[PDB]
Ligand binder design. Sequence first.
Ligand SMILES: CC(C)CNC(=O)[C@H]1N(C(=O)[C@@H](O)[C@H](Cc2ccccc2)NC(=O)[C@@H](NC(=O)[C@@H](N)c2ccccc2)C(C)(C)C)CSC1(C)C
Lengths: 116, 116
Amino acid sequence: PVIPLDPARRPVIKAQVDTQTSHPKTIEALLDTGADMTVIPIALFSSNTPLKNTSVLGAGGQTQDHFKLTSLPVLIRLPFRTTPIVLTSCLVDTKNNWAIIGRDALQQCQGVLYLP
Amino acid sequence: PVIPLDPARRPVIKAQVDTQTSHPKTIEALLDTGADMTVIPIALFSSNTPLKNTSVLGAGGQTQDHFKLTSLPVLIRLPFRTTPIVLTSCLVDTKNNWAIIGRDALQQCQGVLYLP
Ligand SMILES: CC(C)CNC(=O)[C@H]1N(C(=O)[C@@H](O)[C@H](Cc2ccccc2)NC(=O)[C@@H](NC(=O)[C@@H](N)c2ccccc2)C(C)(C)C)CSC1(C)C
């Protein structure tokens, strides 16, 4: 689709995310051109799966413990497209349950920004 | 222009920014659909400018000190538009001097996200 940009409304999409560690779930995710890497809520993973420690720089400072990195690829299906986005690795939100589609996924989408 | 999306290459643009407290300056800004509000560097202001305290939530955490709010509108000229974007207020990064064009500015130049 064409998604209009408005400060009062976050640009969101429904995405089916398969962590390959439990059953795929459809979630609402922010579409974010400022994110290098996609973020998935920890809730989407089985309780025992191995994750890696990671450090992330964001607007509030540098966090050492808020995010992890996945061990397995993540598959994402978007409502209009038949082909899964395959992400070799992405971020995992161990706290605030953020779901954010970043430029890794938008590239495999052929997503663009358009400014007339 | 059409701006393609690549995890390895941040979508950045040259923006002439007028704070109205000294002359217009060129910065290189991240184009960011996950940003509610535009962020400009404190380095654009001279030492004694009245700015408001504000609390901002990002991936790094909630911060009450890193960012301030402008007192006056901010004027932003992009290379391919003749009419200035005028933001009633925006964020001022006192800590790292980041430059981020958010949805406030992108709405005014009719920016869209496009997913085929
Ligand atoms: C975890 C990933 C996303 C790290 N990368 C980044 O964070 C990059 N940025 C991004 O990816 C931005 O699009 C970011 C998305 C985000 C919003 C709120 C909590 C977590 C993530 N947006 C912000 O940080 C922005 N904060 C907000 O817009 C804030 N009002 C907010 C609060 C809760 C939900 C949505 C929005 C500002 C400070 C730039 C205005 C801005 S700074 C960055 C390093 C270039």
